[PDB]
Ligand binder design. Structure first.
Ligand SMILES: O=C(O)CCc1c[nH]c2ccccc12
Lengths: 99, 6, 99
């Protein structure tokens, strides 16, 4: 797709039989979700943003489908106000910024 | 409004 | 141009006659820049993100050049760790996500 930015670039994602939605986020190094369904044990990670720094839960090798495109990579679970797909996964689906 | 992650 | 996302999408901008660099952020509703002086009257605004809220000064109808592309709109100024161009100005340069 070619997605304009007049609204939030929210897309359908699927992880483990669960349909969610997340924001295609070029300003995020990482993919951060508020919750994942029963994802098991995780690694502690610190990330930062405009307001400060937060503790997140790192899960590696997650099978995720983004707007129909299959990707494998790291998903963080953390107190993000919106579910975000970061560059770690955006590159995997061949996503670019164009103007 | 948000402004998303270092 | 076409910008891949293997690294942060930082680009050259020009604002208040000064060359700066800023992160093209599809996950930012608004444009937030580091401390600088801008013309006109500002209003107090708060913006959210990862790590909490920050206080910014809102300047309206500001001219910004993003990779030589002219855009007029709202620029927030405050204690951001990185200059961020949000959707409010990305739309003004016809920036799209493509995959
Ligand atoms: O005094 C200043 O320099 C700006 C104060 C300021 C900006 N955004 C704000 C939001 C709420 C309260 C105060 C502010």
């Amino acid at each position: 797709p070619q997605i304009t930015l007049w609204k939030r670039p929210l897309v359908t994602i699927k992880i483990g039989g669960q349909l969610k939605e997340a924001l295609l986020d070029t300003g995020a190094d990482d993919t951060v979700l508020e919750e994942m369904n029963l994802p098991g044990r995780w690694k502690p990670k610190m990330i930062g943003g405009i307001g400060g720094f937060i503790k997140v839960r790192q899960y590696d090798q997650i099978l995720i489908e983004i707007c129909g495109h299959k990707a494998i990579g790291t998903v963080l679970v953390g107190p993000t106000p919106v579910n975000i797909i970061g560059r770690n996964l955006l590159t995997q689906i061949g996503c670019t910024l164009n103007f | 409004x948000v402004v998303x992650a270092x």
